Every structure is written in structure tokens, then in C-alpha cells.
Amino acid sequence: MSKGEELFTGVVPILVELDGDVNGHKFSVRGEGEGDATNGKLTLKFICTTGKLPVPWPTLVTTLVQCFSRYPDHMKRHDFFKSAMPEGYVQERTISFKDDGTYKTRAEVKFEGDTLVNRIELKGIDFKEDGNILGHKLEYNFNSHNVYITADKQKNGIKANFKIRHNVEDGSVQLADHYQQNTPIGDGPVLLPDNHYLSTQSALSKDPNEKRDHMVLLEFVTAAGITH
Amino acid sequence: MHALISNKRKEELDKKLLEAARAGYDDQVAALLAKGADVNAADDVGVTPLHLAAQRGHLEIVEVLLKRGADINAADLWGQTPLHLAATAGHLEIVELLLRWGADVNARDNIGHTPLHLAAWAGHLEIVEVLLKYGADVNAQDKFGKTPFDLAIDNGNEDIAEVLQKAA
User: In sequence order, which residues have a C-beta less than 8 Å from that of residue B28 and are 6 or more positions away?
Assistant: First the structure.
């Protein structure tokens, strides 16, 4: 609880490792960066290292660290991610795209050495071949969304559900419904937050000096919902 | 060759300068600057010694680097300037020094935030007043359309919201 909060009192390096297969195609993305939990700032850069990514980059933004979300001084009691950090937690995600295939995601977030490691396993099924995702028909941008977090009271974790709205190159919005559940790893009492929500902002960029499939991301996250 | 050896030694000097600036060793920073290190050196992500010195609150190192020719308006991969980091960290003296030396007060990162945006987001009243003194635009808008007053009002900041309301 308090130890996790004391851990996030500065700039922390972040390492993200993802490996997955969608419709048979195999890829593995490695990302490195820095996070500042005091203000909710995240600056990361991701590389594919296996050639050309079979899927559009934004589809993986929500899969590629909830512990770096800013919580005001009157919401410090509703911070589950920081309270369970020293050992980490486990994230289960089901991303159902609209009229397309689905993603299943199993991730573990741990604190190793001085860095924070997010290890992800992905499995994509039922994707079309002329669709926006596998056909590379999604543009390079990201909107802002609200993520609603509620308790579970049985598995010491939390539940979340939201909807990402992507932008097609033909002036269309594709809706990916995300269902999430978080469970602790270590056997220690952790804070169970009440119903609240997180506001997010993201900006996708490009590095002009990298000749691979790269993605530069700058992200801000904050907590709201509760009044005190 | 001598050219390759010179380049390798210069790169080692630049890396030592960056490490010293991040750590906060003013004596080593001055010694490396005198030996011929590059004050405008950058990482692979574009972070310069001024960025680290301003973010971590090393006022003396910031002032030493300014007098040697450090670019006060330099953006990393994420489009941040030393003023952005100084304002979001809350260092009043470094912000004042940067503003006096001629830091751009209306620069925008990859989301369109200005230093006043980050000052309102973090919740530092004195930085808001100082930025408004030098001519910050109150009605600036980011990519999502939010304004420095909106970020203050929705983040629980009260006095900053009142100041921004007065400034109109």
C-alpha cells in the first residue's frame, strides 16, 4: 500500500515485451521508455524488430501500465495498482472489434530490478482479410476515452470495461469494446477502490531517424469521479 | 584512424556529460565542458543535458549550460522543451531563469499542451502567475480542445481556476 506509493515517487524506466500471433502471423514488439506517476506522464517508444507489423499500430496502444495514473490527494485510498506493485498484478483483456475478429490478452506487470516490466501474450482470431485491421485501413491517431473501474470483492482484483473508437481512412469509426480484469500476484492486503473512472490522452508520433516499424507514444492519465 | 578515434572520444565525452548532468554533478559538468564536451549533445531520443538539468531541478547546472550555448528551445521525440519539464516539475527558479533567458512561452508538445497547460495540470499557482506575467496565452487549445482553465477545473485545482478566470 504505502510502500507501492513510495516506489512511484520519481521517474521510473519502463520495459514492455509483447509477443503474439493473429490469423497465423507472428510478431513481437519491444518498447522502452519512462514514466512519471506524480503527473501521470508516460513517454515510450516501441519497435517491431521482426519486419512489418501485421496489424495497425493503434490497435495495440491499449495492450502495450495502469500504475502510472495520477491520483489526487483525496483519492489516494482508491489506488489498487500502486498498492499491489512490488510483486505486480495480472491483467486479462478481451478486445471485441465490431464486425471483425477478437483479441485475447494475458499480461503480467512486475517490478524487476529498478525497472517496471509489462509482459504480454496476445491471441487474435476471426479476422477478415479485406477488413480494416488486417488490410491496414486505420489511420495514425488516437482519441481520448474514459475507463470505468469497479471492484470485485471476491478475487482481490478490479473490473473495467470501455470502448475505443478508431478512425478509418474513409471517415468511419470502428468500435473496439474492451473488457478487463485485474488480479493481484502476491499474497498481501491491497486497497480495493470504489467505483470511479480514469481520463486518458494520447499522441502518436514518428521518429525520422529510425528505419524500422516504430511508434512513439506520449500519454497522460488522471483519475476522477469521486468528490471530496 | 585519427578521425574515427576523435569521433569516438568525442562521443564518450558527450555521454559522460549527459550522465553528469542527469546525476547533478556540477563540478564534473564544468570540467567536461572545459575539456571540449558538446553542450548540444543528445540521446537517441533527443534528450539534451539542459532537459535533464531543468527536469531534476539543478539550477546551477542549468545556468552554467545556458552561458555556453545550450539551445533553450529544443524538442525531444515527444516535442517537449526544457520549459515544459521545468513547469510540470514545479521548479520556480529554473522556470524564471529560462523565461528571462528567452524561453518560448507558447510552445506545444505532441498533444498541443503549452507550459501553462502543464502548470495547470500539475497544480502550481506560482508557476501559473509567472507564466502569465511573461505573456502566456490563456485561451490556448490542445488537440482535444481543452483549455488551461478546463484542465485546472476538472483536476480539482481551485485557486488556479480562479486566477485563470480573472485573467479571462
Answer: B16, B20
DSSP state of A191: -
Q: Testing the interface with A: which of B22, B52, B78, B144 to mutate, by most A Cβ within 10 A?
A: B78
Closest CB to B77 among A202, A216, A220: A216
Nearest CA in chain B to A71: B155
Q: How many CB pairs under 8 A join A and B?
A: 40
CA distance to A12, A36, A146, per residue, from A221 (Å) = 16, 11, 10
CB contact under 8 A, B155 and A222: yes
Name all contacts of B144-150 with Cβ < 8 Å and 24+ positions apart: B144/A144, B144/A201, B144/B111, B144/B112, B146/B117, B148/B114, B148/B116, B148/B117, B148/B119, B148/B120, B149/B120
E strand or H helix that includes residue B54: helix B49-55
DSSP H or E stretch at residue B165: helix B159-167
CA distance B74 to B83: 10
How many structural domains is chain B composed of?
1
Query: For the purposes of burial, counting CB atoms within 10 Å of the CB of B152, is it exposed (0-12), middle (13-18) or buried (19 or more)?
Result: buried
What is the Cβ-side half-sphere exposure of residue A113, based on CA atoms within 13 angstroms? 7
Sequence ranges of the domains in chain A: 2-224
A146/A178 Cα distance (integer angstroms): 12
The Cα-based distances of B7 to A25, A206, B4, B49 in angstroms read: 42, 28, 5, 19
Chain B CA closest to residue A214: B77
CB atoms within 10 A of CB A74: 11
Q: Are residues B155 and A39, on separate chains, in Cβ contact within 8 Å?
A: no
Spelled out in words, what is the top-level CATH class assigned to the domain A2-224?
mainly beta
* Closest approach of B156 to chain A, Cα-based (Å): 8
Domain hosting residue B120, numbered range = 1-168
